[PDB]
Enzyme design. Sequence first.
Site, short mmCIF file in Angstrom:
data_model
loop_
_atom_site.label_atom_id
_atom_site.label_comp_id
_atom_site.label_asym_id
_atom_site.label_seq_id
_atom_site.Cartn_x
_atom_site.Cartn_y
_atom_site.Cartn_z
N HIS A 53 -7.84 33.35 25.15
CA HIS A 53 -6.81 32.87 25.82
C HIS A 53 -5.63 32.21 24.55
O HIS A 53 -4.87 31.65 24.79
CB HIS A 53 -6.67 31.83 26.97
CG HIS A 53 -7.32 30.40 26.64
ND1 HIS A 53 -8.62 30.29 27.03
CD2 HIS A 53 -6.95 29.65 26.10
CE1 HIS A 53 -8.87 29.08 26.54
NE2 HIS A 53 -7.69 28.52 26.02
N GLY A 93 -6.76 21.40 24.29
CA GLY A 93 -6.91 21.35 22.85
C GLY A 93 -8.31 21.49 22.63
O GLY A 93 -9.08 22.11 21.37
N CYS A 126 -10.49 23.62 24.10
CA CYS A 126 -10.97 24.94 24.08
C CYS A 126 -11.56 25.61 22.87
O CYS A 126 -10.99 25.18 21.73
CB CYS A 126 -9.92 25.99 24.72
SG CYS A 126 -9.32 25.25 26.30
#
Lengths: 304, 304
Positions: free
Chosen positions: A41, A143, A145
């Site tokens: 993503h 943030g 991820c």
Amino acid sequence: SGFRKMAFPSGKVEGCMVQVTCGTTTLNGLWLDDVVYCPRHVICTSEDMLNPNYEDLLIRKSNHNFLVQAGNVQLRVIGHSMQNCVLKLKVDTANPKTPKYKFVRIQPGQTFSVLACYNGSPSGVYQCAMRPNFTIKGSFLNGSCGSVGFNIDYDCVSFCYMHHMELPTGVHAGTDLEGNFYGPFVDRQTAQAAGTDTTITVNVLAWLYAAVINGDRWFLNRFTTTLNDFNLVAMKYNYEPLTQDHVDILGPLSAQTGIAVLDMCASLKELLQNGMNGRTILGSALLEDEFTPFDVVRQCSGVT
Amino acid sequence: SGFRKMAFPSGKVEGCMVQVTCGTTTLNGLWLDDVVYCPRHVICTSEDMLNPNYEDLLIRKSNHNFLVQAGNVQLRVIGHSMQNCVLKLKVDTANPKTPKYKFVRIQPGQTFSVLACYNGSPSGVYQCAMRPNFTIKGSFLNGSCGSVGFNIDYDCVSFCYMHHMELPTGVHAGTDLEGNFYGPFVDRQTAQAAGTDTTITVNVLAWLYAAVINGDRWFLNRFTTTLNDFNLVAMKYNYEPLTQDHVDILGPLSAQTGIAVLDMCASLKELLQNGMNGRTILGSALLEDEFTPFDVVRQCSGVT
Ligand SMILES: O=C(Nc1cnccc1CO)[C@@H]1CCOc2ccc(Cl)cc21
Ligand SMILES: O=C(Nc1cnccc1CO)[C@@H]1CCOc2ccc(Cl)cc21
């Protein structure tokens, strides 16, 4: 003396953390050998996350669109590919700090440490369990991820988790390092049901053994039970059913303390039926399930 | 989303850990620049620990008697000196992995991470608080002596603790990095009273703010209190008295959530007087005091 929710030393993992930016999105990547792994993503804008067509979004990206940085180290991207929900960016330089590592898919009820990162920088480390419903109750903000979960056996880091998403309920979901989600989750901004969760019975029993070893023994009683009788209580209290495989992995703790597994089950049965009566066990006022039997053996014997 | 007992990433500290052996005793040392710091009891045998005369024991030792090793790195000892309860071994090589560091003496109620080590090798990392009675409730076995506690502010490791001893009660005692014990402890195998401990009030309130931020708000009520009234309750329940300095450090949490500090005190007052009624707060069934207001701000904002 003492028993703590201990994480693995994070040094070997800190050396692999990088920042990955694609367009306006920035998250964390894991640099091992000449490959950087990150959630796919990273190629989405906030708008794309509703129902992203990742194959189409990735086609609009070229190697030069992935900005990979580790402090003053800017990595040159020479390839990109999507594998399930992870992107693999081939770089021209192998990470000099790559530890000996493996990629493993952990089982529900197993534990691991998480090195929470933002913009490629480590912020903290904590130990957690993969819930029986394949979620993790972590501590992650926007943030985070790309932050990873891992275990260490001597010099080998076994990476088992990469953080992708927060569910509307505040619990976390992610993948193994091949990009396969743990659980039924999809990398879409849609409400997604996490299954009914249960308490990890074998871990609670392991933690009761850790308590006895460290001096907390008020919960030991004059009773015993059977796997069948215990499992009727476990069903009532939403605990995982105990199997002979769970009894078998508790053998070292049973052998060290001399408390038969079914006798410990009888203590757990009385704690479930009566509560803790305002008392604590290893500084907790609830039944702890984030320590596996192996965690207890390792911690109680001082394994490095 | 979520709130965890998070430790600092231990990488910078792992790079400083060494094994120190003198005679038959082996423990952990901290190698910073060209000096290795370790507990002075490394010069004792088990027999010496009853009432050691460290000045006399150290006189029988020469530089070549201190064996310092970091894996395949054998350090050459060119000087030795005792400072309070620590030995400082000057080595001929500066540690190439020395991070930017400071030595700090923390205050009671402050928190820090511990990198538990055995034979110079890291085993795990956990976060804890220095109790108001200057003990720590850690997880340490024989061989863990010399393991250190620290905090990190960007690239600077502030070392605050070095582990020395387990008290007969299973709690831990140690020194700052100048070898001064926290509390009344002496490095002797004698029963030593730890003072009456209290719960760290400012930390419990900080953790209640962390709970509100993360969605656990069932304990918020329609009441308020005064510092005086709250302190009568804190005295009854063996909590540290709340001061205006504690209220002042809670200002950012009060400002973010819009809950006045004295209103949060009224929730803490009702939780103390009525218990948790079988409910949990951030996965705990007791009032947690191992998170300072700064820990909550750092974790809730994702500081790296
Ligand atoms: O969940 C997310 N991230 C996140 C992760 N951990 C903690 C906090 C946040 C910030 O929301 C993003 C934003 C929201 O939408 C989706 C949907 C799907 C996927 Cl894979 C990622 C995301
Ligand atoms: O306390 C000790 N160590 C220890 C530390 N942490 C956890 C477990 C252990 C093993 O007992 C040793 C052995 C006992 O006697 C004394 C007396 C004084 C001093 Cl400074 C050190 C020691």
